[PDB]
């Protein structure tokens, strides 16, 4: 009954509501909030700085040798006003389809132009940028 209506949003998140699969154009900030009892589903998307990583990323150097980055972490944040558009276009898991599904391709494209030494030592500080 009213148990489902209430829901905590947590600080630093924004809640997006689905009306049986359709995204309402109303978003709720942190704090106590109330929605419809059973025909609306809320999910909170983080709008503060957050981090996530991908492990064992291959990288083929210009010399034909393959080197595997153990871990590549990306720290990102989403402005609160664009949350509605972001979730509408790419759902609540936008990060996987926007960043971490192409990290490996970007790394391989960068590596293909640089040699093993060039990536391992010389321009290591430039890989991040």
């Amino acid at each position: 009954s009213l148990f489902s209506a209430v829901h905590k949003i947590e600080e630093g998140h924004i809640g997006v509501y689905y009306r049986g699969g359709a995204l309402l154009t109303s978003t709720s900030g942190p704090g106590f909030h109330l929605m419809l009892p059973f025909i609306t589903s809320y999910k909170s998307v983080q709008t503060t700085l957050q981090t996530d990583e991908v492990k064992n990323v291959p990288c083929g150097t210009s010399g034909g040798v393959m080197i595997y980055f153990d871990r590549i972490e990306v720290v990102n944040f989403l402005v609160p006003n664009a949350v509605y558009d972001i979730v509408k276009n790419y759902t609540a898991d936008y990060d996987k389809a926007l960043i971490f599904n192409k990290i490996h391709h970007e790394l391989n494209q960068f590596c293909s132009v640089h040699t093993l030494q060039e990536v391992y030592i010389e321009l290591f500080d430039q890989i991040d940028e």
Binding site: Y18, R19, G20, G21, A22, L23, K88, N89, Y90, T91, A97, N101
Partner: protein, 54 residues
């Protein structure tokens, strides 16, 4: 039970006896004919998929 609650980011196309009705339907709750009509939703947003060992 006929209600189908089309998803967000998809668009639904119906089939009345294996025929494409000219009327689509956007996200949200919708009502179709009880049994003669069957719906299916195709994703109109960004969609990823791959082929392996090419």
């Amino acid at each position: 039970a006929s209600i189908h609650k089309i998803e967000e980011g998809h668009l639904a196309v119906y089939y009345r006896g294996g025929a494409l009705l000219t009327s689509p339907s956007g996200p949200g709750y919708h009502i179709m004919l009880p049994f003669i009509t069957t719906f299916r939703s195709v994703q109109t947003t960004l969609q990823t998929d791959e082929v392996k060992n090419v």
